[PDB]
Each structure stands twice: as C-alpha cells, then as structure tokens.
Amino acid sequence: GQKLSAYVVDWDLPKSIAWDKLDHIVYAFAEPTKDGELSGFTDSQLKSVVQEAHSRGKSISLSVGGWTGSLYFSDLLKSSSSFDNFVSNLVDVVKEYDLDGLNLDWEYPNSPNGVACNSKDENDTANYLKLFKALREKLGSKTILTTAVPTAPFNDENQQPSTKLDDNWASTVDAFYIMAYDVNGIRDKNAGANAPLYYSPKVTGVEPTSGNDAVKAWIAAGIPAEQLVLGVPFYGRVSKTLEPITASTGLYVPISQSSQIKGDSTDEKAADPCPNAVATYSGQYIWRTIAQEGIARNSSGWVTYWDDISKTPYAYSFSGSKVLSFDDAASLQDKVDYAKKQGLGGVMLWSLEMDDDENTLLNALQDIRK
C-alpha cells in the first residue's frame, strides 16, 4: 500500500518535493475530453516528475478527473464504444508516462452536485466499477488503481449514497481516498470546519459529516478500513460571519450565504466549465499564507481558537468579519492518530505546494508511515 500520498497540481508544482517524507505522488489532473482523450496537463512536467519520482524509488499515479475534469465521465462510460476508447486511452497514458497507477477522481457519479452541467446517469457507479475492472484486466495487478471519493459512498441509481457496495469494488480497487475536506461552506447556514475530524448531531446548520463519519460510512458500505485513505487539506477556508466571533460564540455561527468571499492570493475568481457559469471565489487560504501571516500567534488581525468538537483550529478576523477554518500541525496529527486507530490504509494530502518551506504540515503526517 501507500501510507502517505501527496497530490501535486499541474498548474502549480512544488518548487521542491520532499521525497523522503512521502510514499506516493498523485499528479493532478488529466481531464477526460468528450472524445475520451486525456487533456489539461503538461507533458513535460509529468515526464519530469515521473523521472524524479522513479530516480528516488517513489511511486507516481496520474489523477484523472477533478472538479473541472468530470464533465464527461458519465457520457464516456455509458456508451460501449466510448468506454472502450477511453479505456484504451487510459492504458496508453500509463505506458506513455511509465505511470505506477491511475487515481480516478470523478466528482461525482450520478450527482447533481459537483459541476452543475456534469453528465450523469443512473448507472454511473456500476459503470465506474466496470471501468476499474477494465483497467485492472488491461494493466494487471501491479498497477495501483485508486479513486478519490466523497464523504459518503458513491450514489446509486436514485442518487442516494450506496448503503451496500458491490464487493467487486473492494476486490478491484486498491484504495479509496476520502476527500474529507471542503465539508462546509456557503451552502450551510452556519460556519463549520473545512475538514472536521468529527461531527456532532447537536450542531445544526452544517453538513452532518466529517472524517470519522465518512470513514464509518465507507466501512459500513463494504470497504475494509485498510483500503480507506483519509484525505487532509494543506489549506483552510474563510467564511463571512454575520456577527463577530468571540470567546463565547464558538465556531458554529451564522454566515453570509450570499456569495463566497475571497480567501488568500491563491484564491482567483473562476467559473465552472458550463455555459453562462459565473466566476466565484472558493475562499481557499493555503497554509503558506496562514504561516506567513502569523495567524497562529494572533497576528495580522486574527484571533485564533480551537474547536474541540471537530478537533480543528479556527480564527476570526474582525476586519472583513471573516472566520478561517483551517488545519495545523496539531489537527493533522489528530487526523493521523485517528487513521492509525481505525487501521486505515494511510492518509493523503491536498496539496503539496501549499505547505511552508519547513514542511510543517507534511511533517505532521509522518506518523502514518511508521
């Protein structure tokens, strides 16, 4: 298995990759086109990084899909001819780039969530498994086949999270990388954690999930814990509170749902790949910024707190009335402790370039690889 996997992104590769602090690089993203070709990544970068990984004895997978790369998965897999062509192209990419694996990041099978104009079909989840089976048959047992997954099992024919997965999921796919981040946001009445480790039903106005709830849901639906990988963020998110946060309010306070405020300098306005889509901010605030601004020592207009329920830090800036939910060394350690206790297969991180030059967050993950 891969104890610690790190996503790196084509549009912003890390200036230096800390190879000795990770086991697996996941290169994001190749985006399937309407014709089932793989586009949206930089040839020379992937070849450079594969060579570096291999020189260092490290495994590298290509991640296929991602948020803006999921438009065509449903269409591609629901037609026999496009399915076969897509499979052929995926096998070709593995050979062309000497990849050790493929990480499929369809966001999401049969879902009106994810990019609004994504194709969708009742058979999406069954077809996704068919895809993994085809890849397994063509590439063999050595290739690492993984999938990045939401906080509940893949949707069934009625767009409901599956309560019982086909046991060929676990027997075909090596690992399931749970995206236990971006959990709360403007779709919720109250602020909540970006990557809560726990969720308590006593808290209303937030999404009723967390790392723990997600892991439990995936295990309950049939995936053994050792094939689950807990994903963690190297960024936080800002929300705009309607009233100030104080020592008395805690994190879970009412927020503006009118529009997502900008996070840090990495938070560029961007529109989803749909007709007439409006450009929006994500509220992303990467660790490098959190560290540089001294948020943790109440600098730069922030006052920091810890949320004991979710086991994550948060901070309030009276200027702009912003709450930042984030992860630090302590909260990442707590996620690792949880992952080890649950006997998970490992952890993964999104994404590597977000760490500071001292590898503060990546260092916080090291207990998973021992």
Coordinates of C-alpha atoms in Angstrom, one line a residue:
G1 CA 0.0 0.0 0.0
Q2 CA 0.9 3.7 0.1
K3 CA 0.9 5.2 3.6
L4 CA 1.3 8.8 2.7
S5 CA 0.2 10.1 -0.8
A6 CA 0.6 13.7 -1.8
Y7 CA -1.3 15.4 -4.6
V8 CA 0.7 17.8 -6.7
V9 CA -1.1 20.0 -9.2
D10 CA -0.1 20.6 -12.9
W11 CA -0.7 24.4 -12.7
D12 CA 1.4 24.9 -9.6
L13 CA 4.0 22.2 -8.9
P14 CA 6.0 22.4 -5.7
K15 CA 9.4 24.1 -6.1
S16 CA 10.9 21.2 -4.2
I17 CA 9.3 17.9 -3.5
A18 CA 10.2 16.3 -0.1
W19 CA 10.6 12.8 -1.5
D20 CA 11.8 11.3 1.8
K21 CA 8.6 12.5 3.5
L22 CA 6.1 10.7 1.2
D23 CA 5.5 7.4 -0.5
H24 CA 3.3 8.2 -3.4
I25 CA 2.8 11.2 -5.7
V26 CA -0.6 11.8 -7.3
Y27 CA -0.4 14.1 -10.2
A28 CA -3.5 16.2 -10.8
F29 CA -5.2 16.4 -13.3
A30 CA -5.7 14.7 -16.6
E31 CA -9.2 15.7 -17.8
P32 CA -11.2 13.3 -20.0
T33 CA -12.5 15.1 -23.1
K34 CA -15.7 14.5 -24.9
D35 CA -13.9 12.0 -27.2
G36 CA -12.3 10.2 -24.2
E37 CA -8.8 11.7 -24.7
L38 CA -6.8 12.9 -21.7
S39 CA -6.1 16.6 -21.8
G40 CA -5.4 19.5 -19.5
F41 CA -1.9 18.6 -18.2
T42 CA 1.6 19.4 -19.2
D43 CA 3.5 16.6 -21.0
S44 CA 7.0 17.8 -20.0
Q45 CA 6.0 18.4 -16.4
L46 CA 4.6 14.9 -16.0
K47 CA 7.6 13.3 -17.6
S48 CA 9.9 15.3 -15.4
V49 CA 8.1 14.4 -12.2
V50 CA 7.8 10.7 -13.1
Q51 CA 11.6 10.6 -13.8
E52 CA 12.3 12.3 -10.4
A53 CA 10.0 10.0 -8.6
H54 CA 11.4 6.9 -10.1
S55 CA 15.0 8.1 -9.6
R56 CA 14.0 8.4 -5.9
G57 CA 12.3 5.0 -5.8
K58 CA 8.9 6.6 -5.4
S59 CA 5.5 5.6 -6.9
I60 CA 3.5 8.0 -9.0
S61 CA -0.1 7.9 -10.2
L62 CA -1.9 10.2 -12.6
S63 CA -5.2 11.6 -11.2
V64 CA -7.9 11.6 -13.9
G65 CA -10.9 13.9 -13.4
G66 CA -11.0 16.5 -10.7
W67 CA -13.6 19.2 -10.2
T68 CA -13.5 20.8 -13.7
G69 CA -12.5 17.5 -15.3
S70 CA -15.6 15.5 -14.6
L71 CA -18.0 16.7 -17.3
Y72 CA -17.8 13.6 -19.5
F73 CA -17.2 10.6 -17.2
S74 CA -20.9 9.6 -17.3
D75 CA -21.2 10.0 -21.1
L76 CA -17.9 8.2 -21.7
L77 CA -18.8 5.2 -19.6
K78 CA -22.5 4.7 -20.6
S79 CA -21.7 4.0 -24.3
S80 CA -19.8 0.8 -25.1
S81 CA -17.7 2.4 -27.9
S82 CA -16.7 5.5 -25.9
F83 CA -16.0 3.3 -22.9
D84 CA -13.6 1.1 -24.8
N85 CA -11.9 4.1 -26.4
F86 CA -11.5 5.8 -23.0
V87 CA -10.0 2.6 -21.5
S88 CA -7.6 2.3 -24.4
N89 CA -6.5 5.9 -24.0
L90 CA -6.0 5.4 -20.2
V91 CA -3.9 2.4 -20.8
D92 CA -1.9 4.3 -23.4
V93 CA -1.2 7.1 -20.9
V94 CA 0.1 4.7 -18.3
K95 CA 2.5 3.3 -20.9
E96 CA 3.5 6.7 -22.4
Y97 CA 4.3 8.2 -19.0
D98 CA 5.5 5.0 -17.3
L99 CA 3.0 5.6 -14.5
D100 CA 2.7 3.3 -11.5
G101 CA -1.0 3.9 -11.3
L102 CA -4.2 5.8 -12.0
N103 CA -6.2 7.7 -9.5
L104 CA -9.8 8.3 -10.7
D105 CA -11.4 11.4 -9.4
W106 CA -14.8 11.6 -10.9
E107 CA -16.7 14.3 -8.9
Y108 CA -19.2 12.7 -8.9
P109 CA -21.0 9.6 -10.1
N110 CA -24.7 10.3 -10.7
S111 CA -24.8 13.6 -8.8
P112 CA -26.4 17.0 -9.5
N113 CA -23.6 18.2 -7.2
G114 CA -20.1 18.6 -8.4
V115 CA -20.0 20.9 -11.5
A116 CA -23.7 21.6 -12.4
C117 CA -23.6 20.6 -16.0
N118 CA -21.7 17.3 -15.5
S119 CA -23.1 14.4 -17.4
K120 CA -24.9 11.9 -15.1
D121 CA -26.6 8.5 -15.5
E122 CA -28.4 6.1 -13.1
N123 CA -25.7 3.6 -14.0
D124 CA -22.8 5.8 -13.2
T125 CA -21.5 3.9 -10.2
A126 CA -21.8 0.5 -11.8
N127 CA -20.1 1.9 -14.9
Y128 CA -17.3 3.3 -12.8
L129 CA -16.6 -0.1 -11.4
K130 CA -16.8 -1.5 -14.9
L131 CA -14.1 1.0 -15.8
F132 CA -11.8 -0.1 -12.9
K133 CA -12.3 -3.8 -13.9
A134 CA -11.3 -3.0 -17.5
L135 CA -8.3 -1.1 -16.3
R136 CA -7.3 -3.9 -13.9
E137 CA -7.7 -6.5 -16.7
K138 CA -5.6 -4.5 -19.1
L139 CA -2.9 -3.2 -16.8
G140 CA -2.6 -6.1 -14.3
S141 CA -2.3 -6.4 -10.5
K142 CA 0.8 -4.3 -10.1
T143 CA -0.7 -1.0 -11.2
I144 CA -2.1 1.0 -8.4
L145 CA -5.7 1.7 -9.0
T146 CA -7.3 4.2 -6.7
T147 CA -10.2 6.6 -6.6
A148 CA -10.7 9.9 -4.8
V149 CA -14.1 9.7 -3.2
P150 CA -16.7 11.9 -1.4
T151 CA -17.6 11.6 2.3
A152 CA -20.3 9.1 1.6
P153 CA -20.4 6.0 -0.7
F154 CA -21.0 6.5 -4.4
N155 CA -24.5 7.4 -5.4
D156 CA -26.9 4.6 -6.6
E157 CA -29.4 4.7 -9.4
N158 CA -31.6 7.1 -7.3
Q159 CA -28.7 9.5 -6.5
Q160 CA -28.6 8.2 -3.0
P161 CA -25.4 7.2 -1.3
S162 CA -25.0 3.4 -1.5
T163 CA -25.5 1.5 1.7
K164 CA -24.1 -1.7 0.3
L165 CA -21.3 -1.5 -2.4
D166 CA -20.8 -4.4 -4.8
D167 CA -18.0 -6.4 -3.2
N168 CA -16.1 -6.1 -6.5
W169 CA -15.3 -2.6 -5.5
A170 CA -13.0 -3.7 -2.7
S171 CA -11.6 -6.6 -4.7
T172 CA -10.7 -4.5 -7.8
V173 CA -9.7 -1.1 -6.4
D174 CA -6.6 -0.8 -4.3
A175 CA -7.6 2.2 -2.2
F176 CA -10.3 4.8 -1.8
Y177 CA -9.0 8.3 -0.9
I178 CA -11.7 10.1 1.1
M179 CA -11.9 13.8 0.4
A180 CA -12.7 14.8 4.0
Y181 CA -12.3 18.5 3.2
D182 CA -14.4 21.2 1.7
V183 CA -17.1 19.8 4.0
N184 CA -18.7 23.1 5.0
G185 CA -19.3 26.3 3.1
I186 CA -21.9 28.8 1.8
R187 CA -24.5 26.1 1.3
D188 CA -24.7 25.9 5.1
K189 CA -26.4 28.3 7.5
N190 CA -23.6 28.3 10.0
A191 CA -19.8 28.2 9.7
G192 CA -18.3 24.7 10.2
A193 CA -14.9 23.1 9.8
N194 CA -13.3 22.7 6.4
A195 CA -12.0 19.3 7.4
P196 CA -13.7 18.3 10.7
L197 CA -12.4 15.1 12.2
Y198 CA -15.8 14.7 14.0
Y199 CA -19.3 15.9 13.6
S200 CA -21.8 16.2 16.4
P201 CA -25.5 15.9 15.8
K202 CA -26.0 18.6 18.5
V203 CA -24.6 21.1 16.0
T204 CA -27.2 22.3 13.4
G205 CA -26.7 24.3 10.2
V206 CA -23.6 22.5 9.0
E207 CA -23.1 19.3 6.9
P208 CA -23.6 16.2 9.0
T209 CA -20.3 14.6 8.2
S210 CA -16.6 14.5 9.0
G211 CA -13.5 12.3 8.5
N212 CA -14.9 10.0 11.2
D213 CA -18.4 9.9 9.7
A214 CA -17.1 9.4 6.2
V215 CA -14.8 6.5 7.3
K216 CA -17.6 4.9 9.2
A217 CA -20.0 5.3 6.2
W218 CA -17.5 3.7 3.7
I219 CA -16.7 0.8 6.0
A220 CA -20.4 0.2 6.6
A221 CA -21.0 0.0 2.9
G222 CA -18.3 -2.7 2.5
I223 CA -14.9 -1.1 2.1
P224 CA -12.4 -2.6 4.6
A225 CA -10.6 0.1 6.6
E226 CA -7.2 -0.9 5.3
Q227 CA -8.3 0.2 1.8
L228 CA -9.5 3.6 3.1
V229 CA -7.2 6.6 3.0
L230 CA -8.1 9.7 4.9
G231 CA -7.5 12.8 2.8
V232 CA -6.5 16.0 4.6
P233 CA -6.1 19.6 3.4
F234 CA -3.0 21.8 3.5
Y235 CA -5.3 24.8 3.3
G236 CA -8.3 26.3 5.1
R237 CA -11.3 28.3 4.1
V238 CA -12.7 31.7 5.0
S239 CA -16.4 32.4 5.5
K240 CA -18.1 35.7 6.3
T241 CA -19.8 35.7 9.7
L242 CA -23.0 37.8 10.1
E243 CA -21.9 38.8 13.6
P244 CA -18.4 38.7 15.3
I245 CA -16.9 35.5 16.7
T246 CA -15.9 35.8 20.4
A247 CA -14.6 33.6 23.1
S248 CA -18.3 32.8 23.8
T249 CA -19.6 32.0 20.3
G250 CA -17.5 29.1 19.3
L251 CA -17.1 28.3 15.6
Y252 CA -20.7 27.4 14.6
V253 CA -22.1 30.9 14.0
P254 CA -24.4 32.2 11.2
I255 CA -22.6 33.1 8.0
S256 CA -23.4 35.0 4.8
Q257 CA -24.7 32.7 2.1
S258 CA -24.9 35.5 -0.5
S259 CA -21.6 34.8 -2.1
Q260 CA -18.2 33.2 -1.2
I261 CA -15.7 35.8 -0.1
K262 CA -12.1 35.7 -1.4
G263 CA -9.5 33.8 0.6
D264 CA -5.8 34.5 0.1
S265 CA -3.8 35.4 -3.1
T266 CA -4.2 31.8 -4.4
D267 CA -8.0 32.3 -4.5
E268 CA -8.5 33.5 -8.0
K269 CA -12.1 34.0 -9.3
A270 CA -13.0 31.1 -11.6
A271 CA -16.1 29.9 -13.4
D272 CA -17.1 26.2 -13.7
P273 CA -17.0 24.8 -17.3
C274 CA -20.7 25.4 -18.0
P275 CA -22.5 27.8 -20.3
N276 CA -23.1 31.2 -18.5
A277 CA -21.3 30.0 -15.4
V278 CA -20.4 32.9 -13.1
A279 CA -16.8 33.3 -11.8
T280 CA -16.7 32.7 -8.0
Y281 CA -14.1 32.7 -5.2
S282 CA -13.5 29.4 -3.2
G283 CA -12.4 31.1 0.0
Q284 CA -9.2 29.0 -0.1
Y285 CA -6.5 30.1 2.3
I286 CA -3.3 28.0 1.9
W287 CA -1.1 27.0 4.8
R288 CA 1.8 29.1 3.4
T289 CA -0.3 32.2 3.9
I290 CA -1.6 31.1 7.3
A291 CA 2.1 30.6 8.4
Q292 CA 3.4 33.8 6.8
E293 CA 0.7 36.0 8.3
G294 CA 1.3 34.6 11.8
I295 CA -2.4 33.8 12.3
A296 CA -1.5 31.2 14.9
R297 CA 0.0 33.9 17.2
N298 CA -2.9 36.2 16.6
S299 CA -1.1 38.4 14.1
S300 CA -2.4 40.1 11.0
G301 CA -5.8 40.9 12.6
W302 CA -6.7 37.4 13.5
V303 CA -7.7 35.8 16.8
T304 CA -7.2 32.0 16.9
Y305 CA -9.3 29.4 18.6
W306 CA -9.6 25.6 18.8
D307 CA -12.8 23.7 18.1
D308 CA -12.9 20.7 20.5
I309 CA -15.8 19.0 18.6
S310 CA -14.1 18.9 15.1
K311 CA -10.5 18.9 16.5
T312 CA -9.5 21.8 14.2
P313 CA -8.3 25.4 14.7
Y314 CA -10.2 28.4 13.5
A315 CA -9.6 32.1 13.6
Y316 CA -11.7 35.2 13.4
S317 CA -10.7 38.5 11.7
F318 CA -12.9 41.4 12.8
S319 CA -11.7 43.1 9.7
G320 CA -14.0 41.7 7.0
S321 CA -15.8 39.6 9.7
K322 CA -14.0 36.5 8.4
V323 CA -13.8 33.1 10.0
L324 CA -11.0 30.9 8.8
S325 CA -11.4 27.2 9.4
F326 CA -8.0 25.5 8.9
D327 CA -5.7 22.7 9.8
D328 CA -2.4 22.9 11.6
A329 CA 0.2 20.5 12.9
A330 CA -2.0 19.6 15.9
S331 CA -5.2 18.9 13.9
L332 CA -3.3 17.0 11.3
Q333 CA -1.6 14.9 14.0
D334 CA -5.1 14.2 15.4
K335 CA -6.3 13.0 12.0
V336 CA -3.2 10.8 11.7
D337 CA -3.9 9.4 15.2
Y338 CA -7.4 8.7 14.2
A339 CA -6.4 7.0 10.9
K340 CA -3.9 4.7 12.8
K341 CA -6.5 3.8 15.4
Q342 CA -9.1 2.9 12.7
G343 CA -6.4 0.8 10.9
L344 CA -6.8 2.9 7.7
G345 CA -4.5 2.3 4.8
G346 CA -3.0 5.7 5.1
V347 CA -3.6 9.4 4.5
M348 CA -3.3 11.7 1.5
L349 CA -3.0 15.4 1.3
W350 CA -4.3 18.2 -1.0
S351 CA -1.9 19.6 -2.0
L352 CA 1.8 19.6 -1.6
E353 CA 2.8 23.0 -2.8
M354 CA 0.6 24.5 0.0
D355 CA 3.0 23.5 2.8
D356 CA 5.6 26.0 4.1
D357 CA 9.3 25.8 3.4
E358 CA 9.8 24.0 6.7
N359 CA 7.4 21.2 5.7
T360 CA 5.3 21.9 8.9
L361 CA 2.2 20.2 7.7
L362 CA 3.9 17.3 5.8
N363 CA 6.0 16.7 8.9
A364 CA 2.7 16.5 10.9
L365 CA 1.7 13.5 8.8
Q366 CA 4.8 11.4 9.3
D367 CA 3.4 9.1 12.0
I368 CA 1.3 7.4 9.3
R369 CA 4.4 5.9 7.7
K370 CA 5.6 4.0 10.7

